[PDB]
Amino acid sequence: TLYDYDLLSKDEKIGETVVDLENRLLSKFGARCGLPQTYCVSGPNQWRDQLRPSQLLHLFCQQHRVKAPVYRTDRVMFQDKEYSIEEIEAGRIPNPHLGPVEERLALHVLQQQGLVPEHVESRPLYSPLQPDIEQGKLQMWVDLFPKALGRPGPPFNITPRRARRFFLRCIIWNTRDVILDDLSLTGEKMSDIYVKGWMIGFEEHKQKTDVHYRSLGGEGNFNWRFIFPFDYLPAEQVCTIAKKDAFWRLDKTESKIPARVVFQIWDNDKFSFDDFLGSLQLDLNRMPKPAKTAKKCSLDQLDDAFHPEWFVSLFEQKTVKGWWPCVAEEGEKKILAGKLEMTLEIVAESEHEERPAGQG
Amino acid sequence: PIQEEEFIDWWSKFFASIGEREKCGSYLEKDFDTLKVYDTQLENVEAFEGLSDFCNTFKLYRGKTQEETEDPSVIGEFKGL
C-alpha cells in the first residue's frame, strides 16, 4: 500500500494491491524475474544462478521437457538444434560485459525460451475509499530468489538517479590578446579588462576576476575558481537547473528549453563606458571538447549549431580544459569577440569531491 | 563504482526505454532491450496459463445443499490440481 507522508497533512493511503506469492514460488517458466538479453556478472545484465549453469539448465530443461545445451563441443545441441556462441553474438551488439562460457551460454539459451524479458511494470494505485479508481501509477518489478537450491545471484542495481549538483569549476587561467572596441586617441592601448561569467540558474553567483593595473600585455594570473553546482543527469543527458524554484521536488530538475543557452553578461569598464567587446556564453550540458590550440580560433568553430556532435560524456576525463571564443553581447552571433582560456567540466558523475582536489 | 555504467546501467536503460525526448542519453546507441510494462501481476500473463499449472486456486464454503438456512461464507484458499 502507498501513502502520502507529508509533514503538513495526514498520510492517507494512495494505493492498494494484493499479491499471491505462490505462483512465483513453484513456477517452472522463470519469467517471474527480469531476463535481459545481455550477459554480465553485475548491473542490469547480471547473471542470476543459484547453481552452476550446467545444473540449472539440466533441471530447467527437465521441467520444460527439452534438451539442455550440456555440450561444449564444436557442435553443441540445444533441443536437437545447433548451438554456439557465434550464433548468439551474431545479430547482436558486441558485449563488453560477456563473461564465463558456461554462464553466458546459459543466459543466452534461456533467452530462446518464451519468457518475459527484463521489464518494469506500472501498477495502478487504488484508494481504500475508491478501490476501483486509480489515484496514480507506480513503476516497479519483482524478482524471486529461492533458497531451495543454492543462492541465486544478486538483485539488479537500481541506485536512484535524483537531483545532482555538478562541481563545475570555472577556472580562469589568464587574460591575453585582448580585443577592444573602445580605443584610445593617443595610440596607447589600455582598458579595464577582466573576465566575468556564470552558469545558467546562478545569476546571483555571478563572479569576475579583478582588474590588472600597470599592465599593458595583460600580464598576471589570478587562477580564480567559480563554482556553479548545476543540475544534470548523465543517464538522460538533459540540460537541467539546480537551485530550482520547483520547491515541490528534491528530485532531478526537468524542463523544456530551446536548443540554445543565453547568458546576461556585460562589460563594465570602470574608467570608461561599457565596451561591447564580447561575453562568454557556453552550454556546459551539451559542451564540445575544449580546444587545445589557438588554431581553432576561426570562423568555422564559432557555430554552436554546427557542433551538437558531442552528445557524449566528458565525465570520464580527469579535466575538461581548453580555449573557448567570446561572443558580442548582441545575442549568440557567429562572430569572434574576444578569447578566453579556462576550465569548464562536468565530472561529478563519478568524482564530485575528489577530482577537484587536484587543483584546490 | 564502474565508469562504464553511465552507458551500460539500469537507470540509463530505464530512461532510454521510456523514450523521453532529449532524456534517453546515449543509451539508445547500445541496442538495449526495451522494457516491457504490465498493469497487473506478471503471474496473470496468459502465456504461462496464469502460472496455475503446478497448482490452481480453489475456495471452501460453509453453505449446504440440503437446507436454505446455512450461510455459504468463504473459508479460505486451497492450492492444488
Side-chain angles (χ1 to χ4, degrees), chain A residues 7 30 34 93 103 106 116 135 141 187 200 209 241 263 273 277 287 290 322 335 350:
Chain A
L7 302 176
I93 195 169
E103 294 183 1
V116 174
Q135 296 183 351
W141 79 99
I200 301 297
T209 65
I241 304 297
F263 301 78
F273 71 92
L277 69 94
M287 176 167 273
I335 189 164
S350 65

PDB file of all heavy atoms in Angstrom, chain A residues 7 30 34 93 103 106 116 135 141 187 200 209 241 263 273 277 287 290 322 335 350:
ATOM      1  N   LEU A   7       4.290  16.475   5.962  1.00  0.00           N
ATOM      2  CA  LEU A   7       4.524  16.995   7.298  1.00  0.00           C
ATOM      3  C   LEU A   7       3.364  17.893   7.690  1.00  0.00           C
ATOM      4  O   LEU A   7       3.125  18.155   8.868  1.00  0.00           O
ATOM      5  CB  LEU A   7       5.843  17.778   7.338  1.00  0.00           C
ATOM      6  CG  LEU A   7       7.107  16.993   6.919  1.00  0.00           C
ATOM      7  CD1 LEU A   7       8.304  17.934   6.917  1.00  0.00           C
ATOM      8  CD2 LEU A   7       7.333  15.832   7.883  1.00  0.00           C
ATOM      9  N   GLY A  30      10.257 -19.255 -15.091  1.00  0.00           N
ATOM     10  CA  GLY A  30      11.368 -18.362 -14.781  1.00  0.00           C
ATOM     11  C   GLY A  30      11.121 -16.957 -15.324  1.00  0.00           C
ATOM     12  O   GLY A  30      11.977 -16.078 -15.221  1.00  0.00           O
ATOM     13  N   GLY A  34      13.274 -10.586 -13.973  1.00  0.00           N
ATOM     14  CA  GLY A  34      13.781  -9.849 -15.124  1.00  0.00           C
ATOM     15  C   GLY A  34      14.811 -10.695 -15.862  1.00  0.00           C
ATOM     16  O   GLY A  34      15.680 -11.312 -15.246  1.00  0.00           O
ATOM     17  N   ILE A  93      24.540  -6.517 -30.690  1.00  0.00           N
ATOM     18  CA  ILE A  93      25.605  -5.572 -30.392  1.00  0.00           C
ATOM     19  C   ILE A  93      26.668  -6.295 -29.565  1.00  0.00           C
ATOM     20  O   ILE A  93      26.318  -7.046 -28.654  1.00  0.00           O
ATOM     21  CB  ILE A  93      25.060  -4.352 -29.613  1.00  0.00           C
ATOM     22  CG1 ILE A  93      26.093  -3.212 -29.621  1.00  0.00           C
ATOM     23  CG2 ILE A  93      24.704  -4.747 -28.176  1.00  0.00           C
ATOM     24  CD1 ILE A  93      25.558  -1.893 -29.122  1.00  0.00           C
ATOM     25  N   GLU A 103      28.203 -19.780 -18.165  1.00  0.00           N
ATOM     26  CA  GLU A 103      27.167 -18.888 -17.664  1.00  0.00           C
ATOM     27  C   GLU A 103      26.567 -18.021 -18.764  1.00  0.00           C
ATOM     28  O   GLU A 103      25.365 -17.752 -18.762  1.00  0.00           O
ATOM     29  CB  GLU A 103      27.725 -18.002 -16.556  1.00  0.00           C
ATOM     30  CG  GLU A 103      28.125 -18.750 -15.299  1.00  0.00           C
ATOM     31  CD  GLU A 103      28.597 -17.837 -14.213  1.00  0.00           C
ATOM     32  OE1 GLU A 103      28.600 -16.647 -14.424  1.00  0.00           O
ATOM     33  OE2 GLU A 103      28.954 -18.325 -13.167  1.00  0.00           O
ATOM     34  N   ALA A 106      24.328 -20.125 -20.795  1.00  0.00           N
ATOM     35  CA  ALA A 106      23.128 -20.431 -20.029  1.00  0.00           C
ATOM     36  C   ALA A 106      22.117 -19.289 -20.107  1.00  0.00           C
ATOM     37  O   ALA A 106      20.919 -19.528 -20.253  1.00  0.00           O
ATOM     38  CB  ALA A 106      23.493 -20.714 -18.584  1.00  0.00           C
ATOM     39  N   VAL A 116       9.337 -13.798 -20.272  1.00  0.00           N
ATOM     40  CA  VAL A 116       9.309 -12.345 -20.199  1.00  0.00           C
ATOM     41  C   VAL A 116      10.718 -11.785 -19.974  1.00  0.00           C
ATOM     42  O   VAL A 116      11.405 -12.209 -19.046  1.00  0.00           O
ATOM     43  CB  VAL A 116       8.378 -11.891 -19.056  1.00  0.00           C
ATOM     44  CG1 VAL A 116       8.443 -10.382 -18.873  1.00  0.00           C
ATOM     45  CG2 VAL A 116       6.958 -12.316 -19.374  1.00  0.00           C
ATOM     46  N   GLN A 135      -5.493   6.579  -8.366  1.00  0.00           N
ATOM     47  CA  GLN A 135      -5.073   7.920  -7.988  1.00  0.00           C
ATOM     48  C   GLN A 135      -3.604   8.106  -8.335  1.00  0.00           C
ATOM     49  O   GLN A 135      -2.915   8.958  -7.775  1.00  0.00           O
ATOM     50  CB  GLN A 135      -5.350   8.173  -6.507  1.00  0.00           C
ATOM     51  CG  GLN A 135      -6.837   8.144  -6.171  1.00  0.00           C
ATOM     52  CD  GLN A 135      -7.126   8.470  -4.729  1.00  0.00           C
ATOM     53  OE1 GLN A 135      -6.206   8.572  -3.909  1.00  0.00           O
ATOM     54  NE2 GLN A 135      -8.410   8.637  -4.401  1.00  0.00           N
ATOM     55  N   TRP A 141       9.211  -3.634 -10.344  1.00  0.00           N
ATOM     56  CA  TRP A 141       9.073  -5.040 -10.722  1.00  0.00           C
ATOM     57  C   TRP A 141       9.541  -5.935  -9.588  1.00  0.00           C
ATOM     58  O   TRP A 141      10.139  -5.463  -8.620  1.00  0.00           O
ATOM     59  CB  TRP A 141       9.814  -5.362 -12.023  1.00  0.00           C
ATOM     60  CG  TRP A 141      11.285  -5.545 -11.908  1.00  0.00           C
ATOM     61  CD1 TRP A 141      11.948  -6.737 -11.844  1.00  0.00           C
ATOM     62  CD2 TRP A 141      12.292  -4.522 -11.841  1.00  0.00           C
ATOM     63  NE1 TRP A 141      13.296  -6.519 -11.755  1.00  0.00           N
ATOM     64  CE2 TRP A 141      13.527  -5.171 -11.758  1.00  0.00           C
ATOM     65  CE3 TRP A 141      12.253  -3.130 -11.855  1.00  0.00           C
ATOM     66  CZ2 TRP A 141      14.712  -4.471 -11.683  1.00  0.00           C
ATOM     67  CZ3 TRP A 141      13.442  -2.436 -11.770  1.00  0.00           C
ATOM     68  CH2 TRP A 141      14.638  -3.089 -11.693  1.00  0.00           C
ATOM     69  N   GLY A 187      47.009  56.321 -29.167  1.00  0.00           N
ATOM     70  CA  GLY A 187      47.738  55.205 -29.757  1.00  0.00           C
ATOM     71  C   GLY A 187      48.196  54.204 -28.701  1.00  0.00           C
ATOM     72  O   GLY A 187      48.639  53.103 -29.034  1.00  0.00           O
ATOM     73  N   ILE A 200      24.027  28.899 -16.010  1.00  0.00           N
ATOM     74  CA  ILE A 200      22.604  29.224 -16.016  1.00  0.00           C
ATOM     75  C   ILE A 200      21.930  28.800 -14.720  1.00  0.00           C
ATOM     76  O   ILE A 200      22.129  27.686 -14.237  1.00  0.00           O
ATOM     77  CB  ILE A 200      21.885  28.539 -17.193  1.00  0.00           C
ATOM     78  CG1 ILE A 200      22.506  28.969 -18.529  1.00  0.00           C
ATOM     79  CG2 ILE A 200      20.391  28.864 -17.167  1.00  0.00           C
ATOM     80  CD1 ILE A 200      22.393  30.455 -18.847  1.00  0.00           C
ATOM     81  N   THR A 209      36.957  38.238 -12.355  1.00  0.00           N
ATOM     82  CA  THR A 209      38.334  38.420 -11.923  1.00  0.00           C
ATOM     83  C   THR A 209      38.555  39.878 -11.577  1.00  0.00           C
ATOM     84  O   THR A 209      37.726  40.731 -11.895  1.00  0.00           O
ATOM     85  CB  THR A 209      39.339  37.998 -13.008  1.00  0.00           C
ATOM     86  OG1 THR A 209      39.212  38.867 -14.143  1.00  0.00           O
ATOM     87  CG2 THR A 209      39.080  36.572 -13.433  1.00  0.00           C
ATOM     88  N   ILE A 241      18.357  22.531 -14.339  1.00  0.00           N
ATOM     89  CA  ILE A 241      18.775  23.631 -13.473  1.00  0.00           C
ATOM     90  C   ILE A 241      18.750  23.286 -11.979  1.00  0.00           C
ATOM     91  O   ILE A 241      17.740  22.822 -11.451  1.00  0.00           O
ATOM     92  CB  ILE A 241      17.887  24.866 -13.734  1.00  0.00           C
ATOM     93  CG1 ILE A 241      17.933  25.250 -15.237  1.00  0.00           C
ATOM     94  CG2 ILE A 241      18.318  26.036 -12.862  1.00  0.00           C
ATOM     95  CD1 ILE A 241      19.305  25.672 -15.745  1.00  0.00           C
ATOM     96  N   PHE A 263      23.195  33.841 -21.887  1.00  0.00           N
ATOM     97  CA  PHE A 263      23.633  34.447 -20.637  1.00  0.00           C
ATOM     98  C   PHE A 263      23.496  35.960 -20.695  1.00  0.00           C
ATOM     99  O   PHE A 263      23.594  36.557 -21.766  1.00  0.00           O
ATOM    100  CB  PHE A 263      25.087  34.090 -20.355  1.00  0.00           C
ATOM    101  CG  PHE A 263      25.346  32.626 -20.251  1.00  0.00           C
ATOM    102  CD1 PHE A 263      25.445  31.849 -21.388  1.00  0.00           C
ATOM    103  CD2 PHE A 263      25.500  32.021 -19.025  1.00  0.00           C
ATOM    104  CE1 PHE A 263      25.696  30.499 -21.300  1.00  0.00           C
ATOM    105  CE2 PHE A 263      25.747  30.671 -18.933  1.00  0.00           C
ATOM    106  CZ  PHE A 263      25.846  29.910 -20.070  1.00  0.00           C
ATOM    107  N   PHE A 273      33.237  53.476 -20.631  1.00  0.00           N
ATOM    108  CA  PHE A 273      31.853  53.075 -20.853  1.00  0.00           C
ATOM    109  C   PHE A 273      31.806  51.585 -21.153  1.00  0.00           C
ATOM    110  O   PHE A 273      32.821  50.989 -21.507  1.00  0.00           O
ATOM    111  CB  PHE A 273      31.231  53.863 -22.010  1.00  0.00           C
ATOM    112  CG  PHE A 273      31.756  53.482 -23.371  1.00  0.00           C
ATOM    113  CD1 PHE A 273      31.118  52.508 -24.121  1.00  0.00           C
ATOM    114  CD2 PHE A 273      32.877  54.095 -23.902  1.00  0.00           C
ATOM    115  CE1 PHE A 273      31.587  52.150 -25.368  1.00  0.00           C
ATOM    116  CE2 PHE A 273      33.348  53.741 -25.152  1.00  0.00           C
ATOM    117  CZ  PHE A 273      32.702  52.765 -25.884  1.00  0.00           C
ATOM    118  N   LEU A 277      32.667  44.397 -26.303  1.00  0.00           N
ATOM    119  CA  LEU A 277      33.730  43.691 -27.000  1.00  0.00           C
ATOM    120  C   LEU A 277      33.433  42.208 -27.091  1.00  0.00           C
ATOM    121  O   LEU A 277      33.905  41.538 -28.005  1.00  0.00           O
ATOM    122  CB  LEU A 277      35.080  43.933 -26.303  1.00  0.00           C
ATOM    123  CG  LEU A 277      35.269  43.301 -24.905  1.00  0.00           C
ATOM    124  CD1 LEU A 277      35.957  41.934 -25.037  1.00  0.00           C
ATOM    125  CD2 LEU A 277      36.100  44.244 -24.049  1.00  0.00           C
ATOM    126  N   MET A 287      28.253  20.421 -23.995  1.00  0.00           N
ATOM    127  CA  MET A 287      29.527  21.007 -24.400  1.00  0.00           C
ATOM    128  C   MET A 287      30.370  20.081 -25.291  1.00  0.00           C
ATOM    129  O   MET A 287      30.487  18.889 -25.012  1.00  0.00           O
ATOM    130  CB  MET A 287      30.314  21.389 -23.147  1.00  0.00           C
ATOM    131  CG  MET A 287      31.703  21.929 -23.393  1.00  0.00           C
ATOM    132  SD  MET A 287      32.410  22.695 -21.933  1.00  0.00           S
ATOM    133  CE  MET A 287      31.761  24.352 -22.110  1.00  0.00           C
ATOM    134  N   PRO A 290      37.042  20.862 -25.457  1.00  0.00           N
ATOM    135  CA  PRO A 290      37.829  22.087 -25.449  1.00  0.00           C
ATOM    136  C   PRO A 290      38.908  22.103 -26.520  1.00  0.00           C
ATOM    137  O   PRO A 290      39.493  21.067 -26.835  1.00  0.00           O
ATOM    138  CB  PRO A 290      38.490  22.052 -24.070  1.00  0.00           C
ATOM    139  CG  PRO A 290      37.654  21.136 -23.241  1.00  0.00           C
ATOM    140  CD  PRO A 290      37.079  20.126 -24.188  1.00  0.00           C
ATOM    141  N   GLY A 322      40.383  23.993 -21.825  1.00  0.00           N
ATOM    142  CA  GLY A 322      40.858  24.469 -23.120  1.00  0.00           C
ATOM    143  C   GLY A 322      40.288  25.836 -23.473  1.00  0.00           C
ATOM    144  O   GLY A 322      39.753  26.544 -22.619  1.00  0.00           O
ATOM    145  N   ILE A 335      30.357  35.266 -34.372  1.00  0.00           N
ATOM    146  CA  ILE A 335      31.471  36.194 -34.522  1.00  0.00           C
ATOM    147  C   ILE A 335      32.484  35.992 -33.404  1.00  0.00           C
ATOM    148  O   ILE A 335      32.110  35.681 -32.276  1.00  0.00           O
ATOM    149  CB  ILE A 335      30.965  37.649 -34.515  1.00  0.00           C
ATOM    150  CG1 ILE A 335      32.106  38.611 -34.889  1.00  0.00           C
ATOM    151  CG2 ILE A 335      30.395  37.995 -33.134  1.00  0.00           C
ATOM    152  CD1 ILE A 335      31.633  39.997 -35.276  1.00  0.00           C
ATOM    153  N   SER A 350      30.985  10.760 -11.512  1.00  0.00           N
ATOM    154  CA  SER A 350      31.684   9.709 -10.781  1.00  0.00           C
ATOM    155  C   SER A 350      32.626  10.265  -9.712  1.00  0.00           C
ATOM    156  O   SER A 350      32.915   9.586  -8.725  1.00  0.00           O
ATOM    157  CB  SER A 350      32.450   8.822 -11.742  1.00  0.00           C
ATOM    158  OG  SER A 350      33.472   9.530 -12.388  1.00  0.00           O
TER     159      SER A 350
END
